[PDB]
Amino acid sequence: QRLVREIAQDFKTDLRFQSAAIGALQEASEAYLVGLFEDTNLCAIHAKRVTIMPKDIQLARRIRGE
DNA sequence: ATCAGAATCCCGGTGCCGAGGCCGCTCAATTGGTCGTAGACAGCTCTAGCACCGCTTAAACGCACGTACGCGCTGTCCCCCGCGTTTTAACCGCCAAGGGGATTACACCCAAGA
Numbered sequence: 001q002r003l004v005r006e007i008a009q010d011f012k013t014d015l016r017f018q019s020a021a022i023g024a025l026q027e028a029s030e031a032y033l034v035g036l037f038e039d040t041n042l043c044a045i046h047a048k049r050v051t052i053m054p055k056d057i058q059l060a061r062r063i064r065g066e
Numbered sequence: 067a068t069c070a071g072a073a074t075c076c077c078g079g080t081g082c083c084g085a086g087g088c089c090g091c092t093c094a095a096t097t098g099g100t101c102g103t104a105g106a107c108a109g110c111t112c113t114a115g116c117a118c119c120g121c122t123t124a125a126a127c128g129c130a131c132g133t134a135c136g137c138g139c140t141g142t143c144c145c146c147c148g149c150g151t152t153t154t155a156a157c158c159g160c161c162a163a164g165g166g167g168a169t170t171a172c173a174c175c176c177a178a179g180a
Contacts (some may be wrong), residue, residue: 016114016115016116017115018114018115019115049135049136050135051135051136
């Protein structure tokens with residue numbers, strides 16, 4: 001919640017947030033991170049490796065189009 | 067280091083079908099006027115958001131030691147890297163299947179209708 005407020009402050013000052021909105025943001029961020037970690041593990045296994053590396057995340061984000 | 071070699075870019079050169087300029091309307095855009103409801107503004111409110119304290123505790127960071135996943139280097143033989151030959155994806159002229167004019171010689175005579 002603190003990170004969300006600090007990020008939203010850079011876009012518009014004096015902003016309020018509801019509990020449902022914060023929960024939805026947290027759920028969406030967790031799902032996106034889980035998907036990114038799945039893609040990272042897939043890329044690491046494809047490279048004959050077990051431990052994940054930032055190169056795996058970069059390749060996943062480049063293939064996904066982010 | 068150094069050269070011979072096939073592969074690549076720019077220049078005379080050219081013309082032609084695509085890019086570019088012009089004419090007549092006419093159907094969409096503009097003007098003017100009459101309804102009129104969804105939009106802008108003021109007011110009451112209380113719920114929802116915000117800041118702070120009391121007490122609690124499992125989560126997060128520093129420590130100890132080695133190891134196994136991480137990564138450089140080696141032996142192999144492999145299946146693509148690349149050239150030479152037509153061929154398979156279609157593109158391009160003469161056979162032996164029939165539809166038709168032509169004939170039954172030459173000259174003469176008789177009979178009977180429009």
